[PDB]
Amino acid sequence: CDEFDQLIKNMAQGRHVEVFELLKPPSGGLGFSVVGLRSENELGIFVQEIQEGSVAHRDGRLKETDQILAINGQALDQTITHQQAISILQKAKDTVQLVIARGSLPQYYKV
């Protein structure tokens, strides 16, 4: 369990991390979209376009370019594909806990 905290620090690589909870409405979603970016050091899920009027938007904390490190205690490690990440996000009901890192890193900008 203390290992999870380290796993996150490793993913964050010195980025500011934050955990927060959002209530997903019974219909509408959290109100943001994501994209996968490959590093070299595997893959990250990054917030793209926060929908106006959404929980995500009205909550005010989440931002474009942040990386979702965890969802409801599940670290988004190599264990699962980017589409599996999205599926988890989509299938999550009610209070969703996200662990976030602020912005991206130069590693994800390599092509």
Side-chain angles (χ1 to χ4, degrees), residues 4-6 8 10-18 46 67-70 99-108:
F4 168 93
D5 191 22
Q6 173 66 15
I8 303 276
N10 291 350
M11 293 180 75
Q13 304 185 55
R15 282 174 292 176
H16 192 260
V17 163
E18 305 188 51
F46 293 78
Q67 186 179 346
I68 293 89
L69 308 184
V99 187
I100 259 52
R102 294 306 194 164
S104 305
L105 280 146
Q107 309 159 19
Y108 291 96

Side-chain angles (χ1 to χ4, degrees), residues 77 79-90 92 94:
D77 58 10
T79 324
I80 57 190
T81 68
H82 76 290
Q83 293 190 328
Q84 287 157 44
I86 298 162
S87 183
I88 287 156
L89 276 171
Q90 289 179 354
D94 304 341

Side-chain angles (χ1 to χ4, degrees), residues 35-40 43-77 79-90 92 94-108:
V35 283
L37 292 185
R38 182 137 285 260
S39 161
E40 346 104 304
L43 179 137
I45 306 307
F46 293 78
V47 175
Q48 279 323 294
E49 264 187 343
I50 295 170
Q51 176 162 357
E52 197 147 87
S54 56
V55 175
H57 174 258
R58 278 191 277 102
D59 185 276
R61 300 181 285 192
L62 193 63
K63 292 299 174 203
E64 284 95 339
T65 305
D66 292 336
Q67 186 179 346
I68 293 89
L69 308 184
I71 306 165
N72 295 328
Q74 179 67 55
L76 302 192
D77 58 10
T79 324
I80 57 190
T81 68
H82 76 290
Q83 293 190 328
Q84 287 157 44
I86 298 162
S87 183
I88 287 156
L89 276 171
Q90 289 179 354
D94 304 341
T95 299
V96 182
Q97 166 173 308
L98 292 166
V99 187
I100 259 52
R102 294 306 194 164
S104 305
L105 280 146
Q107 309 159 19
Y108 291 96

